[PDB]
Structures are given as structure tokens and as C-alpha cells.
Write a protein that binds this ligand. Sequence first.
Ligand SMILES: [Cl-]
Lengths: 156, 157, 156, 157
Amino acid sequence: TIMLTPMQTEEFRSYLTYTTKHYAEEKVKAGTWLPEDAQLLSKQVFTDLLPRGLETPHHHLWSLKLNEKDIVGWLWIHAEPEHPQQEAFIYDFGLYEPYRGKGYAKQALAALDQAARSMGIRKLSLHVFAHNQTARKLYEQTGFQETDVVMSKKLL
Amino acid sequence: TIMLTPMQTEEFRSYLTYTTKHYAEEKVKAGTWLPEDAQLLSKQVFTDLLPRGLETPHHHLWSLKLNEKDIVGWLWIHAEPEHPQQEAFIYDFGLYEPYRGKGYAKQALAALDQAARSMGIRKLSLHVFAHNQTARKLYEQTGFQETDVVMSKKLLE
Amino acid sequence: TIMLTPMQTEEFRSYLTYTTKHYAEEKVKAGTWLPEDAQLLSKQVFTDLLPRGLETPHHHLWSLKLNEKDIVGWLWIHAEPEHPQQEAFIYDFGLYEPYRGKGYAKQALAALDQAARSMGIRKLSLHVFAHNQTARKLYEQTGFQETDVVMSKKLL
Amino acid sequence: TIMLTPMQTEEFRSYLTYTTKHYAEEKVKAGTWLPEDAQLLSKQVFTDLLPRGLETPHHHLWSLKLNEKDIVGWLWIHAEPEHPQQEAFIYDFGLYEPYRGKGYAKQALAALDQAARSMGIRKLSLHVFAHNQTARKLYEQTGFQETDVVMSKKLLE
Ligand SMILES: [Cl-]
């Protein structure tokens, strides 16, 4: 069973250093940002989104735990303030490498729905880099549907 | 400094599951293998390439360490029998997610050269998926040059 | 402007050098260490602080960037896990000579306060040799205040 | 007094890196090089000068130090093999940040004059960036004279 627990002091900091570098690398792979810029741009994006870290209102950061000594992953959603459709955006979701391939991801996704609905969230929204095919499949399989797609192409 | 230590049975098995699952994802991304196929096709390739696993002669799978605690990545090279140019193929190389974005990859690539030379290898060869742009640039920056290019095109309907 | 970014391995290589040697030049200009021992003690001090280099847990080493053309300085803090006052200790902070005396130091401390807050850090502490009056003033200017003092006297 | 001592491989690594980075900054400052190239271009400049690091023939890389315990600077000179004027070119010279103004440079140049005289050097030459007014005044005081000048004018941007 995957339980969601509000991230603690240390789990958060480590997570911040992690997703901060990751987001940057994902933006490079997507071809949106430049290598020598990725790191810096990322830090700023996450600092602006979380001025007060865990204290930042309406933001909910969880450490997906399989049990008490196994932190399989993370989950970060933002519950819009009185959103006209009570929607929440998922800023981040995933499992640490040494826990992927067991199917916990999908289980984590079912706990998210459960935990979100108990909170009064009636809709989930999220961004996923197109190059993350595997993760796109998982989302689709668990019910998510595409709404917007960004595309590009290099010329001569 | 990045240390090359030969993988132990514990690491190998975990590495195999990792790389295999990853390779399937790469083949699908490249458009080479269909999703439904990917997974299966992947285990076979690595199984045929590594019959006896770590005991498959001429293969050298190493765990890249920054120190005795931080295992930054993996490195797997093959040194064919009496190769006319003492070349060795790099079947796999990369760092784990938590250790990327620090420049260890390039340093890990310099420990590769140092190691190959110490063992007789005079040339290195490798494969990189066209979509792996960051990797290609890294290899190009460390002196690697493109020799062969595979391309494909889908037709309408 | 001045922004933070995870320090890179080669930078850390050059940084650890340029700083292990400076910490010896200061430890000597303070009498604490003898001129013919400093260089050897500095290394022991820095190797003990960073056993896993940039991967040493809870230690955050950042390069100070002015632009995507060069890094002007460095900033190293340690967020003591479970610290009653959620304070981080500033183990090192400085700008390279060519990028000193422009006002980037204060910008960097402002960037530090912004980063600490987003990390959940509510307090900052640091060490600074007494002879380094330049830094002492700047620190007091940024809200820092003395709490402890080490003094020595040669008898013979 | 400040005297010359063959540079060590450890001091060289840190120095080469520091001089290659510094040279890029100067080049960018003079406007001669573009920011996005400075770093890469600089390396090529130093690798060609020292193909064999410290062992590059006719090149002498010394560490400056008062007593044999405080390395406060560096002196890099090239005594070309059979030079029509027996001249030695000073590729690089200076002291570290924590060692400046103490008048070591003057004492360093003197040790250079003494060493140069010992090795047969009947003439010294060097390059100094235009913005380096500090170094320029120093050299003038030690008897150096300008012979060549490079100038630029930007018409636009
Ligand atoms: Cl960080």
C-alpha cells in the first residue's frame, strides 16, 4: 500500500535539490532550455513556486511511502484557490530509481485520486514532457487525457 | 575522482533489470520497437550479449563511484578478441538520476579512457540514440566522432 | 544580477584548492596555525567537512553567477538536520578578485536569504576571521550579528 | 627573497586551469574574444603552447616563493632553441590573490633577470593586455619597453 505523508524538513530539501536539477535536465531533453542555462532557470522556477518551501499555501508536497523505511517517491500538487472546477495541478510525481518497475507508480496514482477527492479536489491537471513516453502511457491508462500539446521543429 | 569497480553479482542483477527496462524505452522512443514488443526484445538482446552474465568473457561491467558511498553510475565495455585496432565497444554508460547535473559524466568518461589504455584498448566505439541529444554532445565534447548514422521515415497511411 | 546554481565538479576542484589555501593564509594571519602547518591542516579540515565531496549530505555548494558567461563566486551552506532553530551554517562565501568590489556580495546574501526561506531555513550563522573586517562590516550590514568571539594572546 | 623553483605537477594543474580561465576573461574584456568562445578558445591556446605540459622543451614553468614554503606566484618563460637574439619570451607572470602589493613582483622580475642572465638570455620579451595597467607600470620600472601594439575600434555591435 502506498501512503502519502506530508514531506518532512529533510525529505523536502533533498527533493528540492533533486527535482531542481531534474526539471532542468528534462527541459534540456525537451529542447526548450539550453544546457548552460537549465540549472539556473530551474532553481528560479522552483524558488518562485515555493517561496516558503513547505509553508507555501495551497501547495501539498508528499513523500510516497511503501512503508516506514521505504520512500518510493514523491507527489506535489497545488490546489488552486477556489478554482472554478476545484482543480489541482500536479507539479511533480515520480518514484526513485530503486523502486521503479514494481508497479508502485500506478498504485501511487490511485492513492493520489483517493487523497485528492477526500480533500474536495474534483479534477487533476498535469504537465508531462512528451519524451516521457512511459509516464505518458501510465497517465493515460489511469484515466488522464491530453488537453494541450506543444510541438516544435528545427529549420535549415 | 570517479572510480571504476567491477560490479558484484548484487549490482549486476539490479543493473540488468535497470538497463533492460531502459533500453526498451529507448528503442520505442527511437521508433525502432513497438511498445508491446520493447520489453521482451530488450531482455533477449542483453541475454544474448551476456550469456553467463558477469562471467561472459571479454565483457567488463563497472560501477562508477565518486567515493566509497556515492555510486554515480555504470560503465559496460566489450573488448573483442584480438581486435585489429584493439578497439572496445561501450555497450552502456550513464549516471543515476541523483548524480547527474554535476559534470561527473565527463569525468567518468575520462576514467574510461584511462582504464581502456591501461588494459591495451587503443580505440573506443559506442552507440547513441539520435534522440539522446545531451549524450551525443557529451561524447562529441570528449573527442568522440560520428562514423555511422541510421535514419528512418514513416510513409503516409 | 547574482543567482545561485549547483556548483560543478570541476569548479569544486578549483574552488576546494583556491579555498583550502586561503583558509591556511587566514589561519596563519590569525596566529591560530603556524605558517609551516596551515597548508596541511586546511586540507584535513575541508576533507573532514566534505567526505563525499559535493555529494556530502546536507551541504549545499553553489556557484555565484552574474551571467551565463562566467561564475563570479561561491557559497557553501550546511543545513543541520533537525536543527531546533532551522538554521544553516555558512561554511564559505566569497567572490573572485576580478568580481569583487562591485556589490555582488550583498546581492549574493540576498539570494541566500531567498534560497534559505524556500528551503525552510529560518536562521543563518557563519564564521569569519577577525582580521577580515571587510566581510564583518558587510555581514553586519546584512543583518548579521556577533554571538561568539575567539581571542588569543602570545605570552612569550 | 623571491626565487624560482621548478613548478610541481600539482601546482601546474591548478595553475594551468587558473591561467586558462584568466586568459579567457582578459580576452573577453579586451573584446577580442566572444564570451561563448573564450573558454574553449583559451584551452586551445594553452594546449598548443604546452603539448607536453611541464615537459614542453625550452619552456620553463617556475613557482615564485620567498622562502621555500610560500608559493606566492608563477613565472612562465620560453627560451627558443637558437634564437637570433638569444631572447626569452615571458608567456605568463603573476602572484596569487592572497599575495599582492607586497612588492613581490619587483623582486620576482629581479630573480628573472638573474636567472635569465644565467641561462644565456640576452633579451626578454612579453605580452601584456592593454587593460593591465598595473603590470604595464611594473614592467616599465624594470626597464621594459613597448615595441608593438594591437588596437581595435568597434563600428557598431
Ligand atoms: Cl540545491
